[PDB]
Each structure stands twice: as structure tokens, then as C-alpha cells.
């Protein structure tokens, strides 16, 4: 089956468990991100994701010991005007994010909790797929309490024209499968949602291609991290296709409600009450969204034992898509 319990292992013992829904923090679109970290730290018990870009520019200052583990994202999101599928508006000027700035942050990072380091990526610094594997094995340090995860990116820099070719908008899944044996050097494989396919079906098929390739080279427990996917529909579908780790900023813009990712003011009207104090609505939405993420995470962990009955929503759709793409 494409869905399986996987994770990050140290000496054969499971340190981080998948399927994992990762709450993400970023300064891009959220200038008060530090205030969000401080408030949500009182409810976040599991792992979360931050950015080395924000660590370098001081957008976030911790403390990060509230989480079970920390995913240090390289900074390619904040260094990019490009956005994910869940972005609904942005007014973002990226600053300079060189390889040296990224290496100094991850080199000096020290934490009592497990840490996952993501490979460096920049919209102007792209390489062929095999060369991306070589960069991540050289830049990501092999250190104690630190896992290594390579986020594959497209092989071509943007042209700047009216349209962009697939070498700019999509990763080379065929090249990832060809060099899939080189994935043993790392702890996890990464691909962004927007760049692993054009629509939902193509993203599920290409995730399944990468999963089947990993299972052939005896990496049956290696997690697949889909960057940017964190909603009530596409995230369970990618898990059924073979993916394992899911992060995003969707929990900070929307509200999860009855299997739907909805507009927050409607969530406050239909659930929180029309007289709820306005200075408490955004934090209450963030708190409820994290608890919803863990409930949805448990439904995905229950699918391996109870089947499709574990999912409380969209059960006919999840089963139909699972049949069609497998």
C-alpha cells in the first residue's frame, strides 16, 4: 500500500513519526510572526517548521523548545516572490539569501530537541536534479540530533517571459526516480506541492512514482515531505498517494471546519459566536486549527488500521481518487 507509517530514524528507533502535519511559521505575509509563535506555543506540543531566512533576519526569536521537533526550512520560500497554492494575496520583496547566510544559520543551530535541516534553494540558484543531490549532501551537515532532508526544485531558472516552460515550473520526476538510489544519503525527500504537478491528479501520480521508486531501493520507511500542502482535502489525498510530511501556512490564513478549509470570518460566525471579542478571534482560529491538524493527523494514522472509516470527511472522494490514481 502507498500509505505507511514512516519517519526519521536514529539507530533504528523512530524519532519523528509520520504521517505528520507540520504547522509552519514564516515572515512572508505575516509581519507579526513572532507574536504568533509566542501565542501558539502554549498549544503546540508536536513538531513545527521555521525558516532559516527568518532566523537570519530576526523575524523570529524563539524560544523554540516548546515543540517536539523543529524543521529548519532553508529559506527558499521567503527568498521567493513565488507562492504556494494556498496563498490568497501578497503585497513580498525578498532580501538577499546567499548560501553562506544559510550555512551560518544551520551551522550554529543548537537545540535540545530533534532538528530536521532542509537543503538550500533559491529561485535564481537552480541545478540539474542529480547536482541538487550532490549539493544537499555537501551543505547539510551530518551532525548529532540533526536529520537531513533534500527539497527537490526545478532545474531551470525563470526566463522572465510571458510564459514559463515546465523546466521552470515543475521538478523532473523522471530524474528523481533515476537517481532514487542516492536518497539513502538523506533522511527525507522533499517536493513542493505546486511544482510536483499541475493539478491534483498529476500531483498524486508523481508522488506515487517517487514512493514506488523509494520502496524499490529499500527505502520503504523514508518520508516524503510535500511543502505547502496543509489543508483538509489535498493533504489526506497526498498521504494516500505515498507522502508522509505536510506543512503550510494555511492554518494561519484559513479555518479548518467540518472537512473544509474556509474563510475565517465565516468560521467565527458559525462556530465561535457573533459576539466573540475581536482581539481573540485570530488566536482562537490558530489554536483550533492546530488541534484540527492533530485530529486530521490521527485520521491518517488510523487509516492504516481502520481503513477509510478513519476519515471523518470526504470519504467517497478519498476512495475514488485512491482507486483512479493507483
Amino acid at each position: 500500500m502507498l500509505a505507511k507509517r514512516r519517519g526519521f530514524y536514529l539507530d533504528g528507533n523512530e524519532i519523528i513519526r509520520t504521517p505528520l502535519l507540520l504547522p509552519s511559521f514564516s515572515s512572508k505575509g505575516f509581519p507579526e510572526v513572532q507574536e504568533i509563535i509566542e501565542a501558539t506555543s502554549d498549544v503546540i506540543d508536536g513538531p513545527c517548521l521555521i525558516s532559516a531566512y527568518d532566523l537570519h533576519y530576526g523575524s523570529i526569536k524563539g524560544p523554540y523548545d516548546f515543540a517536539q521537533a523543529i524543521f529548519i526550512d532553508s529559506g527558499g520560500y521567503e527568498a521567493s516572490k513565488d507562492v504556494e497554492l494556498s496563498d490568497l494575496g501578497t503585497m513580498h520583496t525578498p532580501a538577499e539569501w546567499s548560501q553562506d547566510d544559510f550555512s551560518r544559520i544551520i551551522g550554529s543551530w543548537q537545540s535540545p530537541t530533534p532538528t530536521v535541516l532542509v537543503s538550500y534553494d533559491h529561485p535564481k540558484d537552480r541545478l540539474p536534479t542529480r547536482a541538487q543531490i550532490e549539493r544537499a549532501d555537501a551543505m547539510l551537515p551530518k551532525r548529532p540530533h540533526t536529520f537531513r532532508e533534500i527539497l527537490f526544485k526545478p532545474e531551470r531558472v525563470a526566463t522572465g517571459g510571458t510564459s514559463e516552460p515546465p523546466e521552470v515550473t515543475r521538478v523532473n520526476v523522471s530524474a528523481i526516480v533515476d537517481n532514487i538510489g542516492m536518497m539513502a544519503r538523506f533522511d527525507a525527500l522533499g517536493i513542493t506541492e505546486k511544482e510536483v504537478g499541475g493539478n491534483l491528479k498529476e500531483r498524486m501520480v508523481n508522488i506515487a512514482r517517487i514512493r514506488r521508486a523509494l520502496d524499490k531501493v529499500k527505502l520503504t520507511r523514508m518520508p516524503i515531505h510535500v511543502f505547502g500542502s496543509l489543508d483538509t482535502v489535498t493533504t489526506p489525498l497526498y498521504f494516500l498517494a505515498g507522502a508522509d510530511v505536510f506543512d503550510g501556512l494555511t492554518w494561519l490564513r484559513f479555518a479548518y471546519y467540518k472537512g473544509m478549509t474556509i474563510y475565517r470570518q465565516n468560521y467565527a460566525a458559525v462556530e465561535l459566536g457573533i459576539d466573540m471579542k475581536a482581539h481573540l478571534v485570530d488566536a482562537k482560529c490558530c489554536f483550533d486549527n492546530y488541534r484540527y491538524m492533530k485530529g486530521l493527523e490521527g485520521e491518517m494514522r488510523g487509516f492504516l488500521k481502520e481503513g477509510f472509516a478513519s476519515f471523518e470527511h470526504h470519504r467517497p472522494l478519498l476512495e475514488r481518487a485512491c482507486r483512479a490514481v493507483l
Binding site: A39, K277, H279, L280, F287, K294, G298
Partner: protein, 305 residues
């Protein structure tokens, strides 16, 4: 549009978190509350329906005849399993203190002595085995009575250490037994069940737990001394982890500032060992508050296994 929409409206983000969480903890759902009560009654079913009177008679029947072993002073009968945890690591998991007079031979010497003299005396009536801390007497009906061996010195009685094993602990078993019994009674007999539930939750942790059974019991006494909440395990169990996450960072003491000699293995105050324990107790406190706020019964079930 209009001016407004900052995450905290210029307030402290941690004050907003407290206002939100306070509002959550004040409203309750009767349906989820009934499901939670049904969960705890099942986890505590073997404990509340244990034939404690039969435990007391069998204790007197197994010690009448052996002059060397003598029953303790304070009545415990805190033996019994909750949430299918079959571990005895503190006074909250033993039924009585079996006191022998004659120390230098060690705790494991007095344990095997109590074991051998009871296995020969109860041969054909019950099975006797020695454990990591206490001697267990299993009978034909399935009842297991836990006996904690102890010795009598010129300094007083001494109970075995929960971690060192080959030495006696520095705790005064008279003081400890008094507090655990007095509080539990003053806690409508719900302190000992809450301690066993807490140890059961900590046992499910894949992480390395470092707190002994004595220290957890000591932390619970410090937590429920000034506890004004509901006398239910659904409210007492979260209070322990939210209190112990802060108390474990400092050496354990009584009300007057005197050491009770239960926290010495955790090093000095604010040590790395105490900080690791604080984070593990804190994550369990967050999981309990988030499971209740989300009305998630399956999340509460996974906490016990």
C-alpha cells in the same frame, strides 16, 4: 477596508493566549464529559472494585507465623492496576510495608528474605515472586498483593530506592506514608488513582522518562495541597502535569522549605535532567488541554494506550 487586524491588537500575545485558553476551560460539553467519565471509570475499574478487605486479611494471614517479617504501621492497600499498567515503582503501588529488623546486607537481601519465607509459608496457597522493588503474592483468584520490603535501623525505617535498587532511599517512610494517605483521604481517595493514571500516561511515552515513582508521588502531594478544582480524574490528572512541569525544575521540599530527599537523583535546580522532564510533562499537559478543548475522546484514549 479599515485600520485593524493585527494578531494581538497591541496586546501581549501570551495574555491573548491566556484569555482564549481561560474561555475554553470554562465551557464544557456534557456529551464529551460523559464519554470522558466513562473512560476513567473503566481505567479505574479494577482499582475501585478491588476486594480490599480480602487484601487485609491475606496480609495478616501471610505474616502471622514469621517473626522476622512484620506489617507496617500506616494502612496503604494502594495496590491494584489502573489503565492496564502492571508496574510497582512507589508507595502508591504497594499494599503494605513489610518491616524486617536484621541493613548492611542491602535492600535485595531483605526482599529475597521476605520472598523466601513467604513462598515456603504460602506454598500451595499463593505464588510469591520478587520484583524490581516489591514482592508480589499472587493467589488463585488472581489477586496480587504488593509488599514493599523495609528494614528497621537506629535511624528509623528505610524503604528501597526506586532507581538505585542496591541501596536504601533517603526518604522517611513515616512522613511519606502519612502525606500520601492524608492527602488521598482529604482528596476523596482520588489522589492515588490520579498518580497511577499519570504514571500510566508517562509509560506510554516513547521518550526516556527519568522520574521515579517516589518523586511522582511527591510531585502530586505538592500539586494537590492547594487544589480547588473538581474532584474528578478528568480535572485532577491535567493539574498534576501542569503543576509538575514547573515543580520538577526545583528540588522537592515540604511546606516549610525542608528537603524530603526524593529529588536528589535529578541533580541541582534547573539542571538538564529537570528541563528534559519539564518538557515531557509539559507536552502531556498540552495534549490533555488540546484533547479536552477539541472534545477528542480518541486523543484522550491514546494518552493511556
Amino acid at each position: 477596508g479599515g485600520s485593524g487586524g493585527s494578531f494581538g491588537s497591541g496586546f501581549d500575545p501570551r495574555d491573548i493566549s491566556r484569555q482564549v485558553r481561560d474561555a475554553e476551560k470554562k465551557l464544557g460539553d456534557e456529551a464529551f464529559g460523559a464519554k470522558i467519565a466513562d473512560l476513567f471509570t473503566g481505567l479505574l475499574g479494577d482499582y475501585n472494585n478491588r476486594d480490599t478487605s480480602l487484601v487485609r486479611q491475606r496480609i495478616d494471614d501471610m505474616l502471622e507465623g514469621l517473626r522476622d517479617v512484620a506489617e507496617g504501621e500506616l494502612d496503604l492497600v494502594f495496590g491494584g492496576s489502573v489503565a492496564k499498567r502492571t508496574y510497582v515503582d512507589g508507595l502508591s503501588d504497594v499494599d503494605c510495608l513489610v518491616i524486617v529488623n536484621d541493613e548492611a546486607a542491602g535492600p535485595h537481601a531483605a526482599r529475597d528474605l521476605v520472598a523466601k519465607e513467604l513462598a515456603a509459608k504460602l506454598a500451595g496457597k499463593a505464588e510469591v515472586s520478587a520484583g524490581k522493588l516489591a514482592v508480589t503474592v499472587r493467589y488463585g483468584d488472581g489477586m496480587e498483593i504488593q509488599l514493599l520490603p523495609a528494614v528497621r535501623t537506629e535511624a528509623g525505617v528505610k524503604i528501597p530506592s526506586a532507581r538505585v535498587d542496591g541501596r536504601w532511599s533517603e526518604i522517611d517512610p513515616g512522613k511519606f506514608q502519612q502525606a500520601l494517605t492524608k492527602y488521598n483521604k482529604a482528596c476523596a481517595g482520588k489522589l492515588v488513582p490520579a498518580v497511577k493514571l499519570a504514571k500510566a500516561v508517562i509509560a506510554q511515552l516513547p521518550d526516556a522518562h527519568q522520574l521515579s515513582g517516589y518523586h511522582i508521588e511527591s510531585l502530586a502531594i505538592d500539586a494537590f495541597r492547594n487544589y480547588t478544582g473538581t474532584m474528578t480524574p478528568a480535572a485532577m490528572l491535567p493539574h498534576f502535569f501542569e503543576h509538575a512541569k514547573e515543580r520538577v525544575l526545583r528540588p522537592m521540599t515540604d511546606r516549610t522549605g525542608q528537603s524530603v530527599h526524593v529529588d536528589g537523583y535529578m541533580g541541582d535546580a534547573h539542571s538538564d535532567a529537570r528541563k528534559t522532564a519539564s518538557h515531557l510533562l509539559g507536552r502531556l499537559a498540552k495534549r490533555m488541554a488540546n484533547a479536552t478543548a477539541a472534545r477528542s475522546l480518541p486523543q484522550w484514549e491514546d494518552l493511556f494506550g
